[PDB]
C-alpha positions as semicolon CSV with decimal commas, in nm:
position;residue;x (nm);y (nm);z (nm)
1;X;0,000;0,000;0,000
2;X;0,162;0,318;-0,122
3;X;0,131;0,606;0,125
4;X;0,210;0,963;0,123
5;X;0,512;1,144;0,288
6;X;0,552;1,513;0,387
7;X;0,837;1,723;0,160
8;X;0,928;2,071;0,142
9;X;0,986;2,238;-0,170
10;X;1,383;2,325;-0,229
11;X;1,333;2,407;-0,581
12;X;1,215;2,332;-0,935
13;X;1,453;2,210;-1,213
14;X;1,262;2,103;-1,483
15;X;0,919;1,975;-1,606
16;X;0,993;1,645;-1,455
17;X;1,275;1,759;-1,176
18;X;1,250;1,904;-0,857
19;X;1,472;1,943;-0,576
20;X;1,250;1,857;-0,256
21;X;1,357;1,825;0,091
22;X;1,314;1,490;0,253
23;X;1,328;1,346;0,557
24;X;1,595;1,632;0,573
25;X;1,771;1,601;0,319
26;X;1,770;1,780;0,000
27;X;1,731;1,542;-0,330
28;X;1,688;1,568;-0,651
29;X;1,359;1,388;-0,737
30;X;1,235;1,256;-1,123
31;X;0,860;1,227;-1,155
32;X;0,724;0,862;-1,208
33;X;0,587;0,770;-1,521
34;X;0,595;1,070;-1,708
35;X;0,789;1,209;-2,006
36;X;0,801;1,602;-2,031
37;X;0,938;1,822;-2,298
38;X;1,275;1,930;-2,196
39;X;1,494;2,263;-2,112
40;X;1,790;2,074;-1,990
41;X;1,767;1,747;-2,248
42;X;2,086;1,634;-2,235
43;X;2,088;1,579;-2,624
44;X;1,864;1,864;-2,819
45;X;1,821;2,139;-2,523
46;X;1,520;2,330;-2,509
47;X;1,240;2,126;-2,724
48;X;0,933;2,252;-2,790
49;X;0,664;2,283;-2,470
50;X;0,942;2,285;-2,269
51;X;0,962;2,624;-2,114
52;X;0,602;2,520;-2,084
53;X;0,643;2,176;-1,895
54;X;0,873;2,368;-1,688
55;X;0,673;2,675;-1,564
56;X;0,350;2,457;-1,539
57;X;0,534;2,249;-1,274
58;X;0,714;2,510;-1,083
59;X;0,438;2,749;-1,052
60;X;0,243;2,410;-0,937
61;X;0,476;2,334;-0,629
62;X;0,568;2,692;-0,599
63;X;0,207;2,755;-0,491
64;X;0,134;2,471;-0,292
65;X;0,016;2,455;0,108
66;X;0,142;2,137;0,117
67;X;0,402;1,923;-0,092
68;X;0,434;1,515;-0,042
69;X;0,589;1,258;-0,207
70;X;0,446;0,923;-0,263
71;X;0,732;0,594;-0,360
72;X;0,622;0,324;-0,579
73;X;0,670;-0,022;-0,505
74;X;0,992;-0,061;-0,688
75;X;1,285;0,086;-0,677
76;X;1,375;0,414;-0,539
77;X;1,580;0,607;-0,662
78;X;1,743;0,560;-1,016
79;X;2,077;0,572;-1,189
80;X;2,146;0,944;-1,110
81;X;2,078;0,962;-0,721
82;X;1,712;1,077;-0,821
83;X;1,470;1,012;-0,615
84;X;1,180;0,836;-0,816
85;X;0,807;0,902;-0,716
86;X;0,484;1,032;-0,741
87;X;0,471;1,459;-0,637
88;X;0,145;1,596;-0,465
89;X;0,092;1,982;-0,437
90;X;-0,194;1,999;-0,211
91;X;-0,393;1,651;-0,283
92;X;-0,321;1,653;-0,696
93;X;-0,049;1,444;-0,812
94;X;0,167;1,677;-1,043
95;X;0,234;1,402;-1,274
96;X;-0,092;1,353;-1,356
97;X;-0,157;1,690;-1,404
98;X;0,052;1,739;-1,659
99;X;-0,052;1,453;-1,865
100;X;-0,370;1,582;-1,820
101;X;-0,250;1,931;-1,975
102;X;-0,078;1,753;-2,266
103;X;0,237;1,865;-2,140
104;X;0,373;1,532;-2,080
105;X;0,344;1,216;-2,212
106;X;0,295;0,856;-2,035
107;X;0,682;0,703;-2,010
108;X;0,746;0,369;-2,082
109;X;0,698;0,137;-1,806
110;X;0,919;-0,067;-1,580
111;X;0,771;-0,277;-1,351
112;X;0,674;-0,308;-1,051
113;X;0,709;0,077;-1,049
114;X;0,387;0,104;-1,201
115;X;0,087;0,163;-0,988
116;X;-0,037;0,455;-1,144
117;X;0,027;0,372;-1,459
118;X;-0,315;0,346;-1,571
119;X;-0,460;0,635;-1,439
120;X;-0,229;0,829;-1,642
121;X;-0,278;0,676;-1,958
122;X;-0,653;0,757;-1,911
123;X;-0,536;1,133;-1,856
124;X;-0,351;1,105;-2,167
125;X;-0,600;1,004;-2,387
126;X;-0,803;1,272;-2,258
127;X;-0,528;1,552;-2,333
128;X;-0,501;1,410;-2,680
129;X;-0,886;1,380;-2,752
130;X;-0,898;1,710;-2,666
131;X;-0,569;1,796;-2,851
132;X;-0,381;1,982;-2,611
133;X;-0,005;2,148;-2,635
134;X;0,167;1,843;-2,767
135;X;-0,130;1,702;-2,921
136;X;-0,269;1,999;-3,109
């Protein structure tokens, strides 16, 4: 049973990066399942949505009462140190959220990191009926 931890805010990185505070100490945390257009890709740079992604998630934990991180029931953290999970700013999971907004799209899956999974992909449909950012 996944459950729901208190964080505090540090600082937003990217649309899928944030630097939280947990269990006092700061980390750099990835969100779960979710692919966002990038400022920092390592590869092209600044692709397109990505200022978007980016100010869509800040602004989002920037304005929140209340930040908490939820683990999966996999692994925790992955290659980089990054903590891997799913981010709440007051009760709405920002992952979702942005698959919702079409600024993200569902990232391929590794089990059993997964729980959400389909959830999301419902979101996503939903973003691309209604042919949002990336999908317009």
């Amino acid at each position: 049973k996944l459950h729901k931890e208190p964080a505090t805010l540090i600082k937003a990185i990217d649309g899928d990066t944030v630097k939280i505070m947990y269990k006092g100490q700061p980390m750099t945390f990835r969100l779960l399942l979710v692919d966002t257009p990038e400022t920092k890709h390592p590869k092209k740079g600044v692709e397109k949505y990505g200022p978007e992604a980016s100010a869509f998630t800040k602004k989002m934990v920037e304005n929140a009462k209340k930040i908490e991180v939820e683990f999966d029931k996999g692994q925790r953290t992955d290659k980089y140190g990054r903590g891997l999970a799913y981010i709440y700013a007051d009760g709405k999971m920002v992952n979702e959220a942005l698959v919702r907004q079409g600024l993200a799209k569902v990232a391929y899956v590794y089990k059993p990191n997964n729980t959400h999974e389909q959830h999301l992909r419902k979101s996503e449909a939903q973003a691309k009926k209604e042919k949002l950012n990336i999908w317009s």
